[PDB]
Amino acid sequence: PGIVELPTLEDLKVQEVKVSSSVLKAAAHHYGAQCDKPNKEFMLCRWEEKDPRRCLEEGKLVNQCALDFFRQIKRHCAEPFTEYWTCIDYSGLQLFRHCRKQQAKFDECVLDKLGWVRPDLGELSKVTKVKTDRPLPENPYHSRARPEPNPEAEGDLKPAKHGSRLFFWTM
Amino acid sequence: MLKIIIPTTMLLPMTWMSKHNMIWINATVHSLLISLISLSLLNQLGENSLNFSLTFFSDSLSAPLLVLTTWLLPLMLMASQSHLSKETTTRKKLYITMLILLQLFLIMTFTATELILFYILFEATLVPTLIIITRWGNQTERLNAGLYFLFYTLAGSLPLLVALVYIQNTTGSLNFLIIHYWSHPLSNSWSNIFMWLACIMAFMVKMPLYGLHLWLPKAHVEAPIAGSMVLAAVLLKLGGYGMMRITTILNPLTNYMAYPFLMLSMWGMIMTSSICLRQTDLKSLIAYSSVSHMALVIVAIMIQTPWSFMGATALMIAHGLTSSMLFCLANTNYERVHSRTMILARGLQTLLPLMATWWLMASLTNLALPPSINLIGELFIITASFSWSNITIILMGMNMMITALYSLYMLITTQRGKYTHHINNIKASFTRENALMALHILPLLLLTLNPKMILGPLY
């Protein structure tokens, strides 16, 4: 019994970034490097509040920053990125292994056109510290008041009054 | 009571290690000193029961019965080595051990303070008696005797146990002193009726009441003599003693349900007495006479009158002595004839004049010749019943009449006649049995002289 509150359709009307999974995979490392702040803030909100109905604005801002990143890569390094993501898309598993020359062209293009460097191995998987300004959810699980603990057992022990007190056994 | 318990317990090693010849002498003499020590226990305060400890206490009801058991213990020892002479020393020592364990259990029973402990030892008397009846028995239905006796006792014993534990949960304690001082009136609830039935029927089984009395004509008749006398003399008194203890918390309900059982005894004491008249075996006749006397004691108990209680206690003591003596005499004659039909050997008054006497006052005390304690115990109950209801007297008046008939009938048909010519094994009276009937008879008249001791706690 209650209300399943749901934000109206207007709040979740994001611009809906539209690139295929192969295109996303091609720009994975550079996007993670130069877009880490919105992703990290949004995910910390998601993990702390534990309520996607609450951190929708961070979901907006992450999409805004992703679209800005893709607009920059469109404006500066369109051709190498296009060839690289097409060559990634050809593979069934989308492995970076086969596509290394196009990766080199894309990397040098973004390095000398947008000042970017790909993260080294394992750099993109380190736990980061975010400087979010939202408060800490006091009751993320919405837990009710806990039952009071049972009365604690304490006190000095003396011999049982009149022994066992079990039938004729006096002692 | 450990001045009587500890020596009784330590009596076991003496017999269990005594030599092949000294077991009988040692057991007899040391049991005699035990009886002497228990003779002290006749020291009774005016109204306060002698509370030796928390678990042991005695009053004017338990002490006479305890003295009876302790004085009795040498008597089985003296009556047994005749039919126990041809046995292995270890087997004889165990027979003695069964007797000592029986006496010990009876002492703890009579001196018990909590009703549960009383129940424990009261029923625990079954096992040594069972061994005595079964293994050392000589007749056929001894194996059937043990089954009948055990099952009849237990069928009442277990509901008593349930009632006692329920009382412990409800009242608070099974201690006699508490349940008497903190006694509360009993409501006429049917659950309370069943509780009364559970608390009553075990003792009435061991009373016995008429109808469910079949374990005695099939148990006392078959047991070895020692077992027979320890059964009739004291084990019958267990139910009466327990009832006297338990009617404190069984009022005022008793009267309303006193009607069925009372007359069941009152009428029953007639039939048993009539059954005594048309008997064929001595031991069965004595057993049925015991049933009738114990039924009179039942009536005394359910009247719940002071006079009834005093007459009851006197009748228990006197009947124990008389029944033990009569069984011993029957064993003497039977062993001399190796049969038990009371027609095979008649007219032995001439042959055995002292047996003729012993039978004469055994019958006289059984017939309740005044002023013997038997007669006064009977008459007190008769007066109490007459106060309760007049008509009782005629039934009472019938009883000794029929009793008197058989009380002399066997004496007429076993010694007061002509000897049987073809039998010749009747030898001179071994002074063992004559002395044994002496130790049976003289305490009877001694207590007749001063019946204020066996008069019970109401005196």
From TrEMBL, chain A:
Belongs to the complex I NDUFA8 subunit family. Residues 132-163 are annotated as: Disordered. Keywords: Disulfide bond, Electron transport, Mitochondrion, Repeat, Respiratory chain, Transport. It is found in: Mitochondrion intermembrane space. Residues 145-159 have a biased composition (Basic and acidic residues). Coiled coil: none annotated. One of its GO terms (biological process) is mitochondrial electron transport, NADH to ubiquinone. The keyword Transport applies. GO terms for cellular component: mitochondrial intermembrane space. Accessory subunit of the mitochondrial membrane respiratory chain NADH dehydrogenase (Complex I), that is believed not to be involved in catalysis. Complex I functions in the transfer of electrons from NADH to the respiratory chain. The immediate electron acceptor for the enzyme is believed to be ubiquinone. It comes from Sus scrofa (Pig). It comes from the Eukaryota. The keyword Nuclease does not apply. Its main location: mitochondrion. Disulfide bonds join C45-C55, C77-C109, C87-C99. Complex I is composed of 45 different subunits. This is NADH dehydrogenase [ubiquinone] 1 alpha subcomplex subunit 8.
